[PDB]
Amino acid sequence: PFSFTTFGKTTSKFTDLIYSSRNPIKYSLPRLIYEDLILPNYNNDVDIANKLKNVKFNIFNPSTNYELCLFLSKLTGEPSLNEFFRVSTTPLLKRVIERTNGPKNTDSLSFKTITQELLEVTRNAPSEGVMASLLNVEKHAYEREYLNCIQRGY
Amino acid sequence: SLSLIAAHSHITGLGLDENLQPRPTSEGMVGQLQARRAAGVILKMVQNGTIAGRAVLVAGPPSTGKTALAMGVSQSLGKDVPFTAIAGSEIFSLELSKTEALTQAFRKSIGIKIKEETELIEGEVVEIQIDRSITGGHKQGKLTIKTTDMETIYELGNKMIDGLTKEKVLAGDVISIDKASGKITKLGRSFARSRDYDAMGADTRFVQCPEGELQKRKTVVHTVSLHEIDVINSRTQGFLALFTGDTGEIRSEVRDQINTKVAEWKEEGKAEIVPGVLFIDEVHMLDIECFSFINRALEDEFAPIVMMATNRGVSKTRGTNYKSPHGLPLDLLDRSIIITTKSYNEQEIKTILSIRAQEEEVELSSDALDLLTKTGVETSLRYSSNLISVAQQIAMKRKNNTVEVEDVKRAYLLFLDSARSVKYVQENESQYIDDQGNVQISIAK
Amino acid sequence: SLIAAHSHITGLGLDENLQPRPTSEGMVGQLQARRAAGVILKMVQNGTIAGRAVLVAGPPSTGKTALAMGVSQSLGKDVPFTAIAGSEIFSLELSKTEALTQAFRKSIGIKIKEETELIEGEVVEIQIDRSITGGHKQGKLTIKTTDMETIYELGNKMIDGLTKEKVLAGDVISIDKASGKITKLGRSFARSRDYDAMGADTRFVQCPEGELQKRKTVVHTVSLHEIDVINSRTQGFLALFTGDTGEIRSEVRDQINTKVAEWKEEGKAEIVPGVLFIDEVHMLDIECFSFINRALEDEFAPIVMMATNRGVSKTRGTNYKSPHGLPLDLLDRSIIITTKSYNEQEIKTILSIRAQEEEVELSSDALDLLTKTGVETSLRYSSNLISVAQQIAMKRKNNTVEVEDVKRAYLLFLDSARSVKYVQENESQYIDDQGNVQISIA
Amino acid sequence: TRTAAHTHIKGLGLDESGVAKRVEGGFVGQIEAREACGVIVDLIKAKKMSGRAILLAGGPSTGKTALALAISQELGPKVPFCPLVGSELYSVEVKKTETLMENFRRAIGLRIKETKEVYEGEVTELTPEDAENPLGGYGKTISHVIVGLKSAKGTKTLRLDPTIYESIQREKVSIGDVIYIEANTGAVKRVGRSDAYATEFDLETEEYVPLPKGEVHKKKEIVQDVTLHDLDVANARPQGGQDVISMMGQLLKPKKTEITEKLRQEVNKVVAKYIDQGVAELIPGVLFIDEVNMLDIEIFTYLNKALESNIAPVVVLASNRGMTTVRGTEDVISPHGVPPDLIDRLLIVRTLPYDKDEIRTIIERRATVERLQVESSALDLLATMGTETSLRYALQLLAPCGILAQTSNRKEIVVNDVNEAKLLFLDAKRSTKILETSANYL
Amino acid sequence: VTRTAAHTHIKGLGLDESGVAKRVEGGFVGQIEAREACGVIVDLIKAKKMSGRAILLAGGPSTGKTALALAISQELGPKVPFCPLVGSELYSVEVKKTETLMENFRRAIGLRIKETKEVYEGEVTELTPEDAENKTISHVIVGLKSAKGTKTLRLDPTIYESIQREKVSIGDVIYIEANTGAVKRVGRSDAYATEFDLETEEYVPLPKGEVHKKKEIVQDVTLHDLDVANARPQGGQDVISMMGQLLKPKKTEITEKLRQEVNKVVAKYIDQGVAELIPGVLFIDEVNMLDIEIFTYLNKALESNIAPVVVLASNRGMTTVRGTEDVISPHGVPPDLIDRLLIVRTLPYDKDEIRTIIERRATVERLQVESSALDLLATMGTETSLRYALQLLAPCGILAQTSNRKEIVVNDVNEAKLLFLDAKRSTKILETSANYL
Numbered sequence A: 001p002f003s004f005t006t007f008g009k010t011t012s013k014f015t016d017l018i019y020s021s022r023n024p025i026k027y028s029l030p031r032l033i034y035e036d037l038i039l040p041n042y043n044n045d046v047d048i049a050n051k052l053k054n055v056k057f058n059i060f061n062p063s064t065n066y067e068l069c070l071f072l073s074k075l076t077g078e079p080s081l082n083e084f085f086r087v088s089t090t091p092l093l094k095r096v097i098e099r100t101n102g103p104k105n106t107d108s109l110s111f112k113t114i115t116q117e118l119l120e121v122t123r124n125a126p127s128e129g130v131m132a133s134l135l136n137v138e139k140h141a142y143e144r145e146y147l148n149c150i151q152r153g154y
Numbered sequence B: 001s002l003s004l005i006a007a008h009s010h011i012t013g014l015g016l017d018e019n020l021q022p023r024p025t026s027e028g029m030v031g032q033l034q035a036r037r038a039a040g041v042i043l044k045m046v047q048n049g050t051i052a053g054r055a056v057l058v059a060g061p062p063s064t065g066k067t068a069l070a071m072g073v074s075q076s077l078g079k080d081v082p083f084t085a086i087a088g089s090e091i092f093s094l095e096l097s098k099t100e101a102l103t104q105a106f107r108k109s110i111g112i113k114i115k116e117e118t119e120l121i122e123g124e125v126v127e128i129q130i131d132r133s134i135t136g137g138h139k140q141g142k143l144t145i146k147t148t149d150m151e152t153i154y155e156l157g158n159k160m161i162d163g164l165t166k167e168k169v170l171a172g173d174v175i176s177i178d179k180a181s182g183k184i185t186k187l188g189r190s191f192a193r194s195r196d197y198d199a200m201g202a203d204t205r206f207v208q209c210p211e212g213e214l215q216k217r218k219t220v221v222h223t224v225s226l227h228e229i230d231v232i233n234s235r236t237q238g239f240l241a242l243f244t245g246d247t248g249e250i251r252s253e254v255r256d257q258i259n260t261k262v263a264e265w266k267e268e269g270k271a272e273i274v275p276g277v278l279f280i281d282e283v284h285m286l287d288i289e290c291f292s293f294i295n296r297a298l299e300d301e302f303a304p305i306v307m308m309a310t311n312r313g314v315s316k317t318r319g320t321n322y323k324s325p326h327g328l329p330l331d332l333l334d335r336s337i338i339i340t341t342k343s344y345n346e347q348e349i350k351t352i353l354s355i356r357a358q359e360e361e362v363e364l365s366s367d368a369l370d371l372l373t374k375t376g377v378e379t380s381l382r383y384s385s386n387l388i389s390v391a392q393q394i395a396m397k398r399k400n401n402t403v404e405v406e407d408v409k410r411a412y413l414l415f416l417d418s419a420r421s422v423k424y425v426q427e428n429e430s431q432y433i434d435d436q437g438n439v440q441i442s443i444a445k
Numbered sequence C: 001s002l003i004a005a006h007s008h009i010t011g012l013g014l015d016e017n018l019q020p021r022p023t024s025e026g027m028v029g030q031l032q033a034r035r036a037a038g039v040i041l042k043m044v045q046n047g048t049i050a051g052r053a054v055l056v057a058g059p060p061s062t063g064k065t066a067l068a069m070g071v072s073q074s075l076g077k078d079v080p081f082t083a084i085a086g087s088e089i090f091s092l093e094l095s096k097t098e099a100l101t102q103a104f105r106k107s108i109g110i111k112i113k114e115e116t117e118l119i120e121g122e123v124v125e126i127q128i129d130r131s132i133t134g135g136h137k138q139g140k141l142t143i144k145t146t147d148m149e150t151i152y153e154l155g156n157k158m159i160d161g162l163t164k165e166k167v168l169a170g171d172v173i174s175i176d177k178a179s180g181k182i183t184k185l186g187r188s189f190a191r192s193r194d195y196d197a198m199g200a201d202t203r204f205v206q207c208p209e210g211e212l213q214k215r216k217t218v219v220h221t222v223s224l225h226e227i228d229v230i231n232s233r234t235q236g237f238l239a240l241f242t243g244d245t246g247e248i249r250s251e252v253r254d255q256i257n258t259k260v261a262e263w264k265e266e267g268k269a270e271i272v273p274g275v276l277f278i279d280e281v282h283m284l285d286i287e288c289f290s291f292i293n294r295a296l297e298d299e300f301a302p303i304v305m306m307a308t309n310r311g312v313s314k315t316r317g318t319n320y321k322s323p324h325g326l327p328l329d330l331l332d333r334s335i336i337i338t339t340k341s342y343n344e345q346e347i348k349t350i351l352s353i354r355a356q357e358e359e360v361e362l363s364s365d366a367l368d369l370l371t372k373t374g375v376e377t378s379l380r381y382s383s384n385l386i387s388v389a390q391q392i393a394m395k396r397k398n399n400t401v402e403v404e405d406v407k408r409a410y411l412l413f414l415d416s417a418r419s420v421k422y423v424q425e426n427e428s429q430y431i432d433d434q435g436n437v438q439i440s441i442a
Numbered sequence D: 001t002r003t004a005a006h007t008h009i010k011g012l013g014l015d016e017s018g019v020a021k022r023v024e025g026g027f028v029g030q031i032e033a034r035e036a037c038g039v040i041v042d043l044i045k046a047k048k049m050s051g052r053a054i055l056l057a058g059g060p061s062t063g064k065t066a067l068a069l070a071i072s073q074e075l076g077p078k079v080p081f082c083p084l085v086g087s088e089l090y091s092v093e094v095k096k097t098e099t100l101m102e103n104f105r106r107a108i109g110l111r112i113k114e115t116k117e118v119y120e121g122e123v124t125e126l127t128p129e130d131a132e133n134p135l136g137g138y139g140k141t142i143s144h145v146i147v148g149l150k151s152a153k154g155t156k157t158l159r160l161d162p163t164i165y166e167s168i169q170r171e172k173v174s175i176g177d178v179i180y181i182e183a184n185t186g187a188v189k190r191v192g193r194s195d196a197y198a199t200e201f202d203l204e205t206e207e208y209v210p211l212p213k214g215e216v217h218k219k220k221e222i223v224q225d226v227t228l229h230d231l232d233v234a235n236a237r238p239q240g241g242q243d244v245i246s247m248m249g250q251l252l253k254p255k256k257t258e259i260t261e262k263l264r265q266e267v268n269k270v271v272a273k274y275i276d277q278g279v280a281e282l283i284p285g286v287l288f289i290d291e292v293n294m295l296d297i298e299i300f301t302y303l304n305k306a307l308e309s310n311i312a313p314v315v316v317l318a319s320n321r322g323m324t325t326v327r328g329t330e331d332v333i334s335p336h337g338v339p340p341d342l343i344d345r346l347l348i349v350r351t352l353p354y355d356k357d358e359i360r361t362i363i364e365r366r367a368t369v370e371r372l373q374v375e376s377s378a379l380d381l382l383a384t385m386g387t388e389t390s391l392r393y394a395l396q397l398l399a400p401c402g403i404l405a406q407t408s409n410r411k412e413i414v415v416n417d418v419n420e421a422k423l424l425f426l427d428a429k430r431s432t433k434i435l436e437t438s439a440n441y442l
Numbered sequence E: 001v002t003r004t005a006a007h008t009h010i011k012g013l014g015l016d017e018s019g020v021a022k023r024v025e026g027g028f029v030g031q032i033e034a035r036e037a038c039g040v041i042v043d044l045i046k047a048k049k050m051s052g053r054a055i056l057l058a059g060g061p062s063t064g065k066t067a068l069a070l071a072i073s074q075e076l077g078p079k080v081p082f083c084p085l086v087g088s089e090l091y092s093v094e095v096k097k098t099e100t101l102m103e104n105f106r107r108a109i110g111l112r113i114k115e116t117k118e119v120y121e122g123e124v125t126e127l128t129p130e131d132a133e134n135k136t137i138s139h140v141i142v143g144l145k146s147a148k149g150t151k152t153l154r155l156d157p158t159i160y161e162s163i164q165r166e167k168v169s170i171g172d173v174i175y176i177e178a179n180t181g182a183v184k185r186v187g188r189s190d191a192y193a194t195e196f197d198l199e200t201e202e203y204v205p206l207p208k209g210e211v212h213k214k215k216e217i218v219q220d221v222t223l224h225d226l227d228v229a230n231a232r233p234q235g236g237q238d239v240i241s242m243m244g245q246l247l248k249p250k251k252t253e254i255t256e257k258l259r260q261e262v263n264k265v266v267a268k269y270i271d272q273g274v275a276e277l278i279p280g281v282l283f284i285d286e287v288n289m290l291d292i293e294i295f296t297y298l299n300k301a302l303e304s305n306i307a308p309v310v311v312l313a314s315n316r317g318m319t320t321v322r323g324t325e326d327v328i329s330p331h332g333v334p335p336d337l338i339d340r341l342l343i344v345r346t347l348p349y350d351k352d353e354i355r356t357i358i359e360r361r362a363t364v365e366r367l368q369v370e371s372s373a374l375d376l377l378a379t380m381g382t383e384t385s386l387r388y389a390l391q392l393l394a395p396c397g398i399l400a401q402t403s404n405r406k407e408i409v410v411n412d413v414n415e416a417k418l419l420f421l422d423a424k425r426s427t428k429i430l431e432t433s434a435n436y437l
C-alpha cells in the first residue's frame, strides 16, 4: 500500500531503528483551548465537576446507594458490592481486557442458558462426539475447503 | 422530598369502604361512584392474584378522571406491587420493534418476591494480620474489625484474602462482610482517619464509623420484575442494560427458559409471583399491530391486568382506514370490560376545586370558590384548576394572603381558555398563518 | 430426510437429442418448456456465454418452479444454483443493488487446484515446548511407518490441532499438510501401561506400509462472494456464516476480478458459471430491474432464471402497469419460456407420481376421483388430499386408501372455492374489510 | 393456581379410531374441526411430511386458538410448539424474512442421545509424583499425578496424565474440594468445597455443595433436546475466540444478524449425518401464526418459498377476516387476507359458531376451572348473556361476579350479583350505543 | 465591541414592583397585558412550588412572543436554568422523539452544589515513597516549594500512581487538587534550565503565590447532566482522552428506573442540605411543528412531580394538526392538550410603537438616524413589514459610511429600498415573469 506517512528518512555495533511514522496532515490546536478546556486549572472547574458527576452522584455508589447495590448483587450474583461502581466507571475496552471472573454466587438470578451449556461443553472436546461436532461446523468448513492455503487477493 | 405539587397529587387512593362501596368524598376522589366501585373490583381481583390476563378499558369524555382513577388504583395498590403507567407514544421506537416494546411492558408489570437472610458485620478495620501459608494454599488472616462499641478477631480463608486484595482495603477502612454468602463491600474511609493524609484520593470516600453491635442480622424482601431477569440473563454484563435502556430484542428462548424456571422456583418455594397492573394511557394512539399483539398476548399465565384509557369516540383506527368505536378494533372490545365515566355537576366541581385549593395551600374565599365553580362548569375543570395558582400569585403580588373575587377576575382576564382563543382567532384570520401558508403581516394595506 | 412438494423430480427428462419423453425422471408433459429448459441447460454447460436472462412464465399450478428445480437437479455437481425469492433483496443493512450483487457473486464459481502432501504413520514421540503462559507453542514430531522414520518440526497450528484429539504414542494418525487435518485412524500398540484418566477405546489398526509422504492434487469450489467476504475484512470467514457483510467496497471487487483472471491464466483456477433463480420476480422494485438491466452486461454474470405467474399488472415502485410486472427494457433482454395448463391425463399422471413417491397406495376409483377433483379446482388441492386420505386410512386400520376415505377427506378439508362460498353466505360472521362484524348469535 | 382464559383445554379428546365425543377434554362442540385437527395431529406424529400448511377460518371467539393449543397438548411437551402473532415478524433490527426463517428453525426440534463416563467426588490428595531420571534444567518433572477421589459408598485412587496438573492449578484445586473429571476430554471442573471441610469457621466465601452420591465412576446415558435454531445461533456466534473482538462482542449487545443459508445448509448436513448414525432423532414441531391476514405480501411470498423447502415443519395459520385486501397490495381482494396461490397451497378448516347450550356448558366449565360456584339460574342468565352479547364478555364477567360474591360472604353466585356486574361493566355493544348517543367526544 | 443579534435590545419585562407594566421599559414598548401575564408566570416560577405548568403564547408573526420568552429568561436570571428549543429539534434519527422530549424535560431542572477547591502549586523538592509492606507503598511524602515558601504533604498510593503516570521527577512544577486528586505536571523548574544546553523539558518559572490556595465555588448542574453522567453505554467518561474511543456511543432510551434512582440520590443529597433544587423553564418555540405523538407524550408527561414550567409559542389559526388528516384546531394544538394550557394572546402593532421600536434598535446598534428618515422607515415598516425595517437599518448605516457620513439621511433609505426588496415586491416580480423569475 501507499504509505501516506512522513517519517525519518536517510538522505545518505548497531544502527537502531525507531518507529517514527506520522500523518502528513497536521491539525493545529492553540494552547488556550487545551490548557483552558481540557486540562485542570485553578480557574477551571473540570476536576470538581468531573468528580461531582462521576463519584458523588453515581447511583452505583455503595456509600449512598447500598440498597441498589445489594439488589443488583442479588440479581447478578457478584461476590463484591463494588463491582457495579467499578464497571460503570471504566473504559469499555479496559473492561474487556480485565475481564476474567470465575466465582459466582449460586443463589442468584444469573442463569446458564442452553447455548451457554453447549458452549461450556465445546470449550474443550475432541472429535467423534455428537454434541461437539454438531456445534463445530465452522472449523469443519475451514478444514474441508483447504482454506488455510488460499492466496491473498486484496 | 424531591417531588412537587402536581395536578394529581391530591389522590391517595380509592375512597372505598370495606364492602367495596365508595364514600362521597374520601382519599381525594369525589363522585364517580360506579366507576370507583368498578375500579375497586379490579383492585380486588389484582390483590387476589388468581386471574391472569384481563383487559379492562376506561372510557369517558375529557377532563373526567380516567387517569385520576388509574393512579388512584395505583395508590390503593401500594408498594412492592409493580405498576407501569406508559403512554401509547412510548411504543414507537427505532431500535426496538413495537411488539417487543409491548412485551417489555408486559414483563415490566409482573414480578416475583425473594426473601434475603443477611448476617452483616459492618465495622472499621484496625489491622489486617496475614498468616502467610508456606505453600500459598488456604491463606489465613486475623481481621481486627471494630465499631465504636466492641472489637474482635476473625478467621479468614484464602478467597477472602483474594477479595480484600482485589479491591484495596487498608487500616481505617469501613467495610461490611456477610457470613452466610461471603459478600464483600468497601464503604469507604472512616471520618476519624481523615486528617492522616493531606490530599485525598480520586476514589476515596468518607463514611461514618458504625454504631452498636458488630454482627447484625436482618431479613430483606426483594421484588424483581420478569423483564429485569430478561435483561440480566441476556448479556454477560447485563445490569448496565437495566439503566441505559439498550436491551435489543431479547429472544424467545430466553423468556421461555425464564418462565419455566420461575415456575419451578414457585414449585420449590423460593419465590412467589406478585401480579401487577399495566396502564396503557391513550391506547387509541397505537397501530393495529399493537392491538393484535395485545389480544394474543393476554392469554399467557404470566400476563398482567391491562388498564387502558380512551377519550375517543367513533373514530378511525390508526394503521387502517375505517372507523371503529373508541378508536379500537372490535377484537379488542370483544376481550374487554368497559368502565364508563360520566361528567360532573356543579357540586362535584366545587368539591374537586376545593380539594385542589387545599392541596396547593391556596386559601379560597367562598365567593371566589363560586366564581371558579362557574368558570369550571362553563369552560372546563382543568382551566379553573390552573386559574387557582395564578390567582394566588396575583393576590400575593397585591400583598394579600387569601384570594378575593378581584384576583380571580384579573386571572380570568389575563389568561384565556380554549373557547375565547378560538373566537379571538376566528374573528381575525388575516393576522394568523392559514392552512395554505397565507398571512398578512402588514398592519396597513 | 423429509419429503417435500418437489421431491419427485430427479432431473429433467430429456434425451441426447433434447427431446423430452412423455414421462421421465419424475416429470410428465410440458414438452416445449422442457425442451427450452434443456436448451438453456446445455447453454449453461457450455459456459462460454454469460449474462443471459431467461424468464419462465405461465399460470399458477403449472410447473414453473418444478421446471426450475428440474434444471437444478440436472445441473450436475459442483455448479452453483442460487435459488432465492423476490423478497430477500430487501434488507436493513444491505442496499438493493448490493444484495443483488452479492447474489450474483454467489451464483458464479471458482474451482481452485491445490497440491497436498499426505503423511500417515505411527507416532514414536511428541515433544511440545510451550511458553509459561501457553502463548508461544513450538515442538517436534516423530512419525514412522515400517519403511522409514522421519522427524518433523511443528508449528503453532499443528500443535494446537494435536492437543485436541489427544495423540498418545503408538497412534496411527493421518496428516494432511495443506488442509491441516489430523485424523487418528486408530491405535496400533495397545500398551500395557494404560492411564486410568483416559477413556479412549480407539480400534486396533494395522501398521501402515509404503512411503511416508504422498503427494495428491485436490480441487475445491468457492464462489466469488465467499472470496469477497474473505478478503473484505480480517474476520471474513465468520461473516460468511453470520452474514455481517455490510456493503463491501468496489475496490475489493476490482482487485478480486483481476486476481481471479490472473489465477485463470496460470491454470491454477477455473471459473465455472451458474444459474441464479428468482422466484416471484414481480415482487422486486423498479431500481432492482434497472440494476439487473445494467448488471447482466458484465463479464462475471450468470444465466439468470426468472419466474412469474402474473399477467399485466402494476410494476412496484411505479404508477403504471406492464406485462408480467416487468418493464419493457428488461423484457427486451429476456427470452420468454411459456407454460400451459394440464388436461385430465397429465393431472392423473402427476397424482400417480405423487402417490408413488409419498408411499401411499390408491385404488383406481380413488385415483379417478382425485383426478376429477384436481381438474375441477386445482392440482395442489388433490396433492394435499393424498396425505390426509392416507392418514384417515391408517386411522381406519386398512392399508389401501379407498373412495370413502378421500370423500371423508374432501368433506373434512376445504378448498378455495368452497371457502369463498362459505364466507360469502356468512358475511356477518367474519370481520369485513370495513371492520364490521356481529359476534352475537342473535 | 392462575387461570388465563385457557387450561380447561386438555387435549382434543378424540376417541381411538373413531369420532370425538360432544363434551370431552374441556371441549364442547366443533365436531368436524376436532376431527380435522386429530387427522392433522396423527399426520404430524407420523413424522413423514414437511411444509404442510393449515388455515383455520372462523368468526371471532370460536375456538381456533383453543384448537391450536389442543394440537400442541396432544403432540406432547417434547414436540416443539412456537405460538406467534403476525405482528411479531416486523423487526427493526433484522429483515422480516430472517425473522420468519428463524421461527421456522425454532419450530424444529432435535433429540440427541449421548453417553458420559465421568469421575467426581471429594479429593483426598494431589501428589505431583516426580519422574525417575528427571531430565536437566527443569525442576518438577512430573511422570503422573495421583488424585484420590472419595464419594458416598466408594473411594478411588487414580493415576492421571502429566498434563492435567496445569488444569489443576488453573482452576485452583486443593485438598478439600469436589472435582469433576471426564474420561475422554480430561478436564477438571471444581464444583466447590465439601461441607465437611468447612475449616474457615469465621469468614469464608467458598461455595459449599454436599458430597456427591453414588460411586465415583458413574457412566450414564443423557438425552438432550435442542432446537435447530439454537444450533444455528450457537454456530453463528464466536465460540470462545479468546481474542479482543470476541470478548468485545460477548460484553456488547447481541445484535441479531441475518444468518446466511450456507450455515443452515452445513447444520442440516451434519444433523442428517448424525441422524444416519442413529445417535440423534429429529422431531418436527407445529408453528402457530395468529391473525395471518395481518402479514404483508412479502411475508406471504417468503412463506411460499419456505413451504416449498425441505426442513420446514407444519405451520398452522388462523384468520378471522372473510373478504379483505391483502396488506401491502392496493386492490387485491382475497379470502381471509391470504393470496390465492398460498390459499391454493394450504388446506382450510372452518369452525362453526356455537349455540346457547354450548355457551352454557363452556361457561360452567370455566367456572369449575376458576373454582367458583354458580347457581343454575345465574348460569342460565349467563347463557342468555352469551347469546345476546359476545361469548368472551360472558366469560370475563365471571371473576367480578366471584369478587362481588366474596364481598357478600357467600360462595354461590346469585342473579343479583351478575346483574350488579352487568351494571358495573358495560358491554362493547352498549358502549357503542352510549357512544352514538353522546355528543361530548365520549 | 459587542455584537448585536435580533433580541439584544431587550433586557427584561420591565415590570414594576406592583405588577403593573410601564409603557416603555426593559426594551419593550406596548404589549402591557402579555407582559403582565408573563410577570405573573415568572412569579409562579420563582415560587418554586408547582410542577407541570404550561403556557401557550398566541399571536401573529412579528408580535414579540420570543421576545417575551427571552424577557422571562432574563427575569428569572442566570441562576434558574432555561432550555430554549425549536419544535423541529425533537425529530431525531438516533433516539425516539418522546425520549428527546423527556430529555429536554430533565434538562430544564437544575441543582446547585457548594464545593471548595483547595490546590497545591510549586516545585517538587523531595519525593520519598515509604514502602511499609504488609512491593506496595504505604504512603509518599512530597514537598512542594514556591516563591512564598514551601510545604510538605502526605499522599496516598493512588496519588503516587497518578504521579508516576505524569512522569513527575524531582524539580517539576505540579498541580495537586486535594479533593479530586488531579495531578497535572506543568513542567520543569526555571532553576534547573542549564543542566543541558538543549532538551525537550518545557521550563516553566516558579509560581509566585503561596503553595496552598483554597477557594469556594458553586457548581450549577442540571438533572440531565447527572443522567448522562451515570448512564454510559461505553463507560470511561472520567479519563481524558484527546483521541476518542474506538466505538462511538449512541444516544439511547434512558429508562424510568435510572430516573427514579437519580431522583432518590438527589433527594438524599438535598435532605442533607448539600444541594439546592432550582426548577426551570422549558421553552418550545413553534409548537405547531410537533407531531401528534409528541402531543400525546406531552399530555402524559405534564403530570409528573418534577416537570418544569413549559412555554409554548405558536402563530397558526385553524390548522390541521401535524400527523393528522381531519383534526382542525386552534394554533395546531390538539384539543385534549389545550385544556391543560393557559393561552395568552399577543397583539399586533401600529405606527407609533413601530417607530419607538425602530429608534430603540437604532440606539442599541448606535447608528444615528435623522428624524424624517425615521418617519420614512416607520411608514415603510407599516407598509411592508416590521422586520424588513429592522433588517434595513444596518445597510442604511453602511451606505452612510461609504459616503463618509455618520447620520442616515433619506437618500440612504431610498438607496437601500431600491437595492434590497421585501417579500411582496419580489412576489410581484415573481408573478409577472414566466421563466422562474
Ligand SMILES: Nc1ncnc2c1ncn2[C@@H]1O[C@H](COP(=O)(O)OP(=O)(O)O)[C@@H](O)[C@H]1O
Residues within 6 Å of the ligand: B007, B008, B028, B029, B030, B031, B032, B060, B061, B062, B063, B064, B065, B066, B067, B068, B069, B311, B352, B356, B381, B382, B385
Ligand atoms: N374523581 C376525581 N376526584 C378528584 N379530582 C378529579 C377526579 N376526576 C378528575 N379529577 C381532576 O381532573 C383533572 C385531570 O383529570 P383527567 O384524569 O386528566 O381527566 P381525563 O381522564 O378525562 O383525561 C385533575 O386535576 C383532577 O383534579
Ligand SMILES: Nc1ncnc2c1ncn2[C@@H]1O[C@H](COP(=O)(O)OP(=O)(O)O)[C@@H](O)[C@H]1O
Residues within 6 Å of the ligand: C005, C006, C009, C026, C027, C028, C029, C030, C059, C060, C061, C062, C063, C064, C065, C066, C067, C309, C350, C379, C380
Ligand atoms: N411437469 C411436472 N412435473 C412434475 N411436477 C409438476 C409438473 N407440473 C406441475 N407440477 C407440480 O405442480 C405444482 C405447481 O408447480 P410450481 O411451479 O411449483 O408452482 P406454479 O406452477 O404455481 O408456479 C408443483 O408442486 C409441482 O410439483
Ligand SMILES: Nc1ncnc2c1ncn2[C@@H]1O[C@H](COP(=O)(O)OP(=O)(O)O)[C@@H](O)[C@H]1O
Residues within 6 Å of the ligand: D005, D006, D009, D026, D027, D028, D029, D030, D059, D060, D061, D062, D063, D064, D065, D066, D067, D362, D391, D392, D395
Ligand atoms: N369448543 C370450545 N370448548 C370450550 N371452550 C371454548 C371452545 N371454543 C372456545 N372456547 C373458549 O372461548 C374463549 C375464547 O375463544 P378463542 O379461542 O379466544 O377464540 P378464537 O378462536 O377466535 O381466538 C377461550 O377462553 C376458549 O377457551
Ligand SMILES: Nc1ncnc2c1ncn2[C@@H]1O[C@H](COP(=O)(O)OP(=O)(O)O)[C@@H](O)[C@H]1O
Residues within 6 Å of the ligand: E006, E007, E009, E010, E027, E028, E029, E030, E031, E060, E061, E062, E063, E064, E065, E066, E067, E068, E357
Ligand atoms: N413590544 C416590543 N418591544 C420591543 N421590541 C419588540 C416588541 N415586540 C417585538 N419586538 C421585536 O421584534 C423582533 C421580532 O419579534 P419576534 O419575537 O421574532 O416575533 P414573533 O413573536 O413572531 O416571534 C424582536 O427582535 C423584538 O426585539
